[PDB]
Amino acid sequence: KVKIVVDGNPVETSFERWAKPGHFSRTLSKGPSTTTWIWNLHADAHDFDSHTSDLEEISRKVFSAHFGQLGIILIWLSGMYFHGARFSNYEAWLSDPIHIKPSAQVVWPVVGQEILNGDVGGGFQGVQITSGFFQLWRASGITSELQLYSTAIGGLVLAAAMFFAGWFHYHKAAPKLEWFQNVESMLNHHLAGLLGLGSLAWAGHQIHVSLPINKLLDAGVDPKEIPLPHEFILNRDLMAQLYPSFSKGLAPFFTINWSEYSDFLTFQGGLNPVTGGLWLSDQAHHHLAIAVLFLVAGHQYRTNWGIGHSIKEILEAHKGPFTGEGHKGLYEILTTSWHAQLAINLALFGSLSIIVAHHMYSMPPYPYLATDYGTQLSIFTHHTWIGGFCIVGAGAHAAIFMVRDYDPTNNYNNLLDRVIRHRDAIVSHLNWVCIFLGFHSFGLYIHNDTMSALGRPQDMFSDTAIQLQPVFAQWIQNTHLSAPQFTAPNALAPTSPVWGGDVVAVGGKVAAMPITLGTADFMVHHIHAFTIHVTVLILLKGVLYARSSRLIPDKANLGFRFPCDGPGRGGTCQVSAWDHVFLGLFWMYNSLSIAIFHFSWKMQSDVWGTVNSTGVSHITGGNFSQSANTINGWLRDFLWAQSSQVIQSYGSALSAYGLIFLGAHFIWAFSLMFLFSGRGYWQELIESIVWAHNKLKVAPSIQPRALSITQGRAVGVAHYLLGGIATTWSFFLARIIAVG
């Protein structure tokens, strides 16, 4: 029986534990003896299952922390709407979105920094933004700063509500453990109620607000003369002027004359030629269909009325001759281990963010997004990075489950047990795949660089020499181009111009165009396959050997996070699953850097550019297919050539990017001191420094220590990632703002 069960007033609201750092931990609550305690307090703060073994207390902490995160996100979102309302050129941009650059940040005049308030157009000075908010606000139908102010105020009210709820559901009415373990009810509610009703309500907003206002905007009406959204709500004749089926009202819906609504629920495909964005009527039909599908999906699981599926029964039924007991025991794992749930959800959420990056560049859903090249590059790169980090986190929390929550008694000859029982085969086969991929992907580039340096371009892997055509992807492109003819007859156009066909041009600039694939694309895709497989190898090997190995048979007793098991057995540094996360982060960085470099160069060379009478003048003039098949081509024609904007940015509004470019190079190099060294050296150096302080009677009572081995690794990888990613960030943004 699914029911609400809470405990009343479980935790008093008091500042007493605020005054006692480390109160949550039995080891840390006694206070410091050394400086290691300062770091351990922050490192252990959100490790709830380390604080207690009671699953109910952990779950309550997780629920209220999630409310806190939602409140922070709403404060951030309300800030973005407020800065659009108060510190932006949004209304001017609305009158002229082709020539005016979006800006919603203004710097104060002090120490000369007002040079960063660039001349972005619309009689406005400020920092140019690349988040895409203007295009999103325009698609929503927002025409004034007053509506941006209203959303900002409403967001802060909802942010306060989230913070109230987190306090309330931890301190006043904390749900019991059986409430959280109602996974069938939660899936039913999150499918039908969150996603389904969310999509239905957003289809409602699109149909009643976004469609008529954007129709008038693309007709050329001044935004100040467009009627407000509630005028389209209250005056059905006003909406029927733009969509004549609205004169029939809701009668076509209730009599199943759905084809009457074809004027605002469409299946055009492709892009709106005025704006370069997806048709908003297509989006309304999409979100309506999505809403219906999710509302149906939320009725699968049994809660209180007999009908529906038991997830445990489904899992226990799916077993076969190769797989022993199959999915038995997985329901108990996924209803008792928060870490197993986090591993799955991080893997899929990160993969989703990466898919979002690809789908939004190829099918730009916002008006004037596709010709705002800075915004396009930024959102692709951002969502790619978020996805990669989330996937590495999935590997981490899978390993944490394996160390802390795995129980061999509950996994006898099931899928998890059998996977552990052939981990050597899995890891050795993946090792071979990674070596093969590295050879036959990177060695092709090395072959090409060597042939080109020796003056033998005819011996190269290229489109004008030994060819490696990606014929499968080319066939996929041709199939998707030909789809409106036969396999999707009621769709007027293909889903994206990238498959084939004509250039979509907005304001004399390319919004989208066919993206052809040749030998360089083959080579870089196999680079992607190689880097992804190596990152998988590191993370999966960390998960499979988290508990034991032939080297260290009792590794689970050493925990998830430990530096080593000593210099013996030849040396066992970085055997822990945590250290596999540490190495997988670097390989994720390598992989995703090549992915976003591939994106930036290929769009600049083959898609983006200006339209003339003769054709398209691309930003870097088609040089991807000529030189992306050598490493020297990447180094010269991408890195050296395109860094001209960031290193010449001094004295302009883009000078902040030049400074951040240098500072990020610095932070990256700074990280190597942590990664390459070891704490024994630093502790001895601190001994000499401490002697100097003791001589002058300025030695602290909290005894200074070098960072732990694990903290040295964590600091090193954090500064490595921050420096490298911020270097690419400044390079990208200065380049595409200055030449876009």
């Binding site: 029986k1 029911k3 609400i4 069960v5 809470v6 405990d7 009343g8 009415a173 809701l250 209730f254």
Partner: protein
């Protein structure tokens, strides 16, 4: 035991175990049904009485301008011309006075009998409640001393009329959205031509 208890709780919301804290407790939910019921009876009588009296000529205001959603509550749907005070100043007064009433009632709920202790211009004599939050009684709230022997029957009648009024107020809202006319205008069109004026013809 409870008045108007039909055993209708398909979402088991009045289950007592586990629902100790918060607003999903049984006591709060019965109290809230009673409060909703009484407000709905005031609304269901009041959202159609000016229209009925204007149609019959008892009041001089035209029936179009005293329709409940055109009299100032939703100014996009209409504003009544010149009350003695503008609606926002009236709302300010309403906030102050209704907050006084509602916070005193709430303090009786959380702390029963506490509103009969502190000086309130002598009004605290009749504001001690009864220990039952939905049914305070006393010398004012039951000033005619009704329900000497049929108090449970009167509670059932109050809840039945309140549920009917709640449904009627929902009907007022739905019919206002669908037809953009008053509820009595809808009733008279249904009476004058029943086949040609209903939900199938308004859709």
């Amino acid at each position: 035991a409870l008045p108007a208890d039909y055993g209708f709780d398909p979402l088991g919301l009045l289950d007592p175990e586990g629902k100790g804290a918060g607003f999903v407790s049984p006591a709060w939910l019965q109290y809230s049904e009673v409060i909703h019921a009484r407000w709905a009876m005031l609304g269901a009588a009041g959202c159609i009485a000016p229209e009925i009296l204007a149609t019959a000529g008892v009041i001089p205001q035209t029936p179009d301008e005293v329709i409940w959603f055109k009299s100032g509550v939703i100014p996009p749907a209409g504003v009544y011309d010149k009350y003695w005070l503008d609606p926002y100043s009236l709302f300010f007064i309403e906030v102050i006075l209704v907050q006084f009433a509602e916070l005193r009632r709430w303090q009786d709920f959380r702390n029963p009998g506490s509103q009969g202790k502190q000086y309130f211009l002598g009004l605290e004599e009749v504001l001690k409640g009864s220990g039952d939050p939905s049914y305070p009684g006393g010398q004012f709230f039951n000033l005619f001393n009704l329900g000497k022997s049929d108090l449970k029957e009167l509670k059932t009648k109050e809840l039945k009329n309140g549920r009917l009024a709640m449904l009627a107020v929902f009907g007022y809202g739905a019919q206002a959205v669908i037809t953009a006319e008053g509820p009595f205008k809808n009733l008279t069109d249904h009476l004058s031509d029943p086949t040609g004026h209903n939900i199938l013809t308004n859709f």
